[PDB]
Amino acid sequence: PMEEEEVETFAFQAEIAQLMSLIINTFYSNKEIFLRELISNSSDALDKIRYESLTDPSKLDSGKELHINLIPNKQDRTLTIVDTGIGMTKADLINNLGTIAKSGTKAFMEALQAGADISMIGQFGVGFYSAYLVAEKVTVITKHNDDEQYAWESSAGGSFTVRTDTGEPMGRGTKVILHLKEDQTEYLEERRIKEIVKKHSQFIGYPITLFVEKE
Ligand SMILES: Cc1ccc2cc1-c1cc(nc(N)n1)Sc1cccc(c1)OCCCCO2
Known part of the structure; x- marks a missing residue:
């Protein structure tokens, strides 16, 4: 049967909206x-x-x-x-x-x-x-202890949505899903991801695992 889900649409704070437009429309x-x-x-x-x-x-x-x-x-x-x-x-x-x-x-x-x-x-x-340098849309799934799982999403343009997530439960934590722009697919390549983690995120005090789908 049909399910009903509540959605809340919000406007970004003015300067955040201006910043996002600057990130997206400038090289x-x-x-x-x-x-x-x-x-x-x-x-x-x-x-x-x-x-x-x-x-x-x-x-x-x-x-x-x-x-x-x-x-x-x-x-x-x-x-x-x-x-x-x-x-x-x-x-x-x-x-x-x-x-x-x-x-x-x-x-x-x-x-x-x-x-x-x-x-x-x-x-x-x-x-x-900075996610908007490479992504046309970003989805953030998050789960904190003693609260429900939430899904945030925005394609910029001045608004974002928030809903209670009825999808796949995470135990606790945050998942950022970057829907990449057509010209930014290099960030799906195993070699490129390893290169950038080695260059910029080498002193992270937690283990990082890269999962690569069989070609
Ligand atoms: C997705 C995201 C976007 C912005 C951001 C933090 C997170 C963001 C937030 C979190 N985890 C991840 N991975 N990203 S958990 C969290 C919970 C409460 C406060 C937090 C972080 O930080 C307060 C400092 C400002 C953080 O700003």
Whole structure:
């Protein structure tokens, strides 16, 4: 029988929308840094659950392994980054993925306008948005302890959606699914992914596994 699901559509905060339009509509040469930014957010989320587990060990009931998985899919042109970190509550999601102003937004846009390399984004606290250098649409699935699994999605254009996820349960953590632009398929290649992780994400304190679909 027909199922019904509630959806909430939100507008991005003005400067976040302006930043996303700048990232999408301007040429940048060193786009590979998007992966460093997402792995760095996963590493931070893994530290959060690790430290919380020291006080309340039952916070690991949802999965004891602390790690990052990278899953390129050449059939549907997606690159997925999964972690078993702390995950996001509904408030963490709506607050960190678009509704709240970030102190570094205006400074970062002015710095990009002056010729700064896109690699500077992380320093400004808006590193996630680098996903739009390579992706036309980003889906974020997240699961925090004592809360439901949520799905966030945006193709930019000024809006994002949030819904309770009725899909595949994750025990705990965050999955970022990058629906790559047609000209950015190099980020589905095993060699290219290894190259960029070696260059930019070599001091990550958690194991990372790259899953490669048999050719
Ligand atoms: C997908 C995402 C986008 C933006 C972002 C964090 C994550 C983001 C968030 C998380 N995990 C992953 N992998 N990415 S868990 C989390 C939960 C609450 C607060 C968190 C992180 O960080 C607060 C600092 C700002 C983080 O900004």
